[PDB]
Amino acid sequence: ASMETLNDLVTRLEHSHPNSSLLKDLSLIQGNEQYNYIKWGDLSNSQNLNELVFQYEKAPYPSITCGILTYNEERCIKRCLDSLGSQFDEILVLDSHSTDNTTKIINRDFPMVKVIYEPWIDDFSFHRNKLISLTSSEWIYYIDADNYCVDSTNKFKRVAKLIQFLSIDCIISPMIKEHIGHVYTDNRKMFSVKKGIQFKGKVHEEPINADGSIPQNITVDIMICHDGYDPEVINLSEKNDRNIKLTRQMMEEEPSNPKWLYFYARELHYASEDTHIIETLLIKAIDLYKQSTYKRYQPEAILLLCSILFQKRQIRKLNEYLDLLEELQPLCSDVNYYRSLILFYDIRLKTGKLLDTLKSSELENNKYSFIDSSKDHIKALLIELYCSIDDWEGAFTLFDELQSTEARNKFLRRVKTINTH
Amino acid sequence: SMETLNDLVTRLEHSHPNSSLLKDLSLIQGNEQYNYIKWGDLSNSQNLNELVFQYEKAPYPSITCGILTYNEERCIKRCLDSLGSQFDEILVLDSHSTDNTTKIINRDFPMVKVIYEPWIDDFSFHRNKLISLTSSEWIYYIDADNYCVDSTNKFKRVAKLIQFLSIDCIISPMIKEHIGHVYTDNRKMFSVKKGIQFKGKVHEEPINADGSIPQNITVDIMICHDGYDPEVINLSEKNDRNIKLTRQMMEEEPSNPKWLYFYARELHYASEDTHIIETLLIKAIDLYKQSTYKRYQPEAILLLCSILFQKRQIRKLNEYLDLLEELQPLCSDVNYYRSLILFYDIRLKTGKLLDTLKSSELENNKYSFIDSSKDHIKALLIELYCSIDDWEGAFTLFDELQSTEARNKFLRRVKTINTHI
Ligand SMILES: O=c1ccn([C@@H]2O[C@H](COP(=O)(O)OP(=O)(O)O[C@H]3O[C@H](CO)[C@@H](O)[C@H](O)[C@H]3F)[C@@H](O)[C@H]2O)c(=O)[nH]1
Ligand SMILES: O=c1ccn([C@@H]2O[C@H](COP(=O)(O)OP(=O)(O)O[C@H]3O[C@H](CO)[C@@H](O)[C@H](O)[C@H]3F)[C@@H](O)[C@H]2O)c(=O)[nH]1
Ligand SMILES: [Mg+2]
Ligand SMILES: [Mg+2]
User: CATH homologous superfamily for A64-226?
Assistant: First the structure.
């Protein structure tokens, strides 16, 4: 009863059965090489592998309930429901007594959907834990009313079947694409309801194991869209205020929990509040993380602080927090991202000083050339320096001053390419 | 009592802003150099009044315009038309043109006198023969591929002024090449009463009767030249002519650096071995040490510098920049080259930064908590590409971006660039 990774199993099947349902389901799991499973024999024996593949073939699909919180979502509720298809065995909408057409649109166009009511009490976990309560299926998947699936393809059913069949203990995250096109992978939206999992936290809630441990998240190749942060459609300030209210509530409940300090900092940052207050909150959070087994968001907190420190040019302090992050997360790309930002800033600074020194040492200061009386060669070098530091206005300005054809070409060439290309 | 031409200009700018004297003085560029003898005290408004009226009243010296021609049917009329009726005598010395050159002159310009003299590979001999044939006080030389922009009687005025103030010099109009570059030390106009003679078979120049090198004064007269326009002229043919005559001068006057500079320059135009050119120029610069003749040394040093910069011999380049600074403290080209060195090193740094980031962080199991797609890193690389003027690389990565927040900076650059057209 050996154990190997999902990726190891993938390899075998990519030789043995490239059209097996098992391989097709496995390849929905991202980061396959993480995560282990237990085999019940020698799978390099082609008979045993055929029996595994065939046993997956005829295994049942777990039942899955889709749970949806609603409050005043007439804008998008139909978009949401239509995107789900017919995968799910049940669709519960827990509505907080909407005064728009939300429930009318549901009753009218979606008679299969069950609508339950529960008044809002400023606790996302309470509402989501109520949906768990009402679920008949083996699994739940949560989608929000301002979300919609692109490529349904029965992938929810398939993922549930695979995870259950291979006895993997986890929460499942689809990918969630914001309206700007940025994709989030740690969402924690789909799990079995038979293990005593409960959400905790009034906002920025997450699923917690019944023993209080933090479950492993596995991201799957299912794309969900969101427009809840699109300023053309919604009042971003209203939601930022909702989040601040509930985050503050959570801080009062759970001081010394760094999670809420980070989110408080993050929300004040969206509202363009005093960065020194944000800075102090993040420093306190990072310090609190050291008392905590809970590590989620520590990287994100360090990186928000970094963004502020870089902006304030506190390079020494910034490097100390990058070093800390490098230690906590050896393979995190963001460290060298920031190390690179520091280097580039200094490069542009050096360039700017060179430009200024040249300009004002031969600012027509009587001094004479032997290469060009018009000093167009110096002007042309200054132009290159301007483009180098992304000061195109200064470039265009001095370009107009050029009294030549050879001097003008280098810039004209470059400009032509941009318009066309 | 003696003072500068600039001093007289100052006095007159207050007293007599419409005097001929001041109008004529202002044709002289670099007035602050050069001196003259006042006759007493010009802070007296009557003395100055008399000087002014004396100048108003003084005669214009006679000027002959001398032109060498060989097969200039293309441009001889453009040339003669541009001269106007200024001159007291126009002499063409023709080397037995086979084209229509002299027919055009005799048909369309009957007052012009045409003399013939077989070409003997010696520009000085031909120019001195023009001196012999001159009836005026002054000679001004123009070539057949030259044409005055706007006469304005400036030649007669310059001659009047220089003679009235007893200034000992050669006169240079400004000569503007087809590319748009202006040369100021051409040495084309002087009195034929002082035993001046041209020397050198090519790149010839006027020499005082005692062997000394006259002072050059540039005047605000624009002359155009298209004799280096490859559209119209066979440059290689002209280059071969000059190398031949230049080699003859090196045999006559070895150890005269002038001819080493010109031989190097000509071999360079013809893309000959840069090591040979370098060796010639180093030799020339070393011969300058032995000579009071300093003309073309700055140009020799700068040609060498161009070559050394191209070969990336930065230490040697800096020695020759330091020499040029010691010789020409106020020459702008030293700082130009010092800036080129620093800009090149900066771009190298930027290039290595780009290469290091891209190779360590893209597509290789390192992860981000900022953006899982790594578009923030790609966005920074795009910035680096633009900084070093590699837009094609920038365009390529730009297309990989999925976030519009990531796209924004490059889009606005390009958008703002676009509106400037
Ligand atoms: O009083 C209320 C307010 C909202 N709702 C519903 O709950 C869902 C919450 O998502 P909403 O779009 O409002 O919050 P958002 O900031 O976009 O979501 C994140 O933040 C949420 C809160 O942490 C999280 O649940 C979500 O998954 C994140 F993406 C949505 O479908 C609302 O209709 C409600 O029923 N009653
Ligand atoms: O065999 C010949 C060849 C040319 N000529 C004439 O001499 C003049 C100068 O020649 P050209 O303009 O071709 O020489 P270029 O290289 O442009 O002039 C420089 O180089 C010249 C050579 O030092 C210098 O005189 C000139 O002022 C510089 F700008 C021009 O008007 C020709 O028609 C000639 O009469 N017999
Ligand atoms: Mg939402
Ligand atoms: Mg010419």
Answer: Spore Coat Polysaccharide Biosynthesis Protein SpsA; Chain A (3.90.550.10)
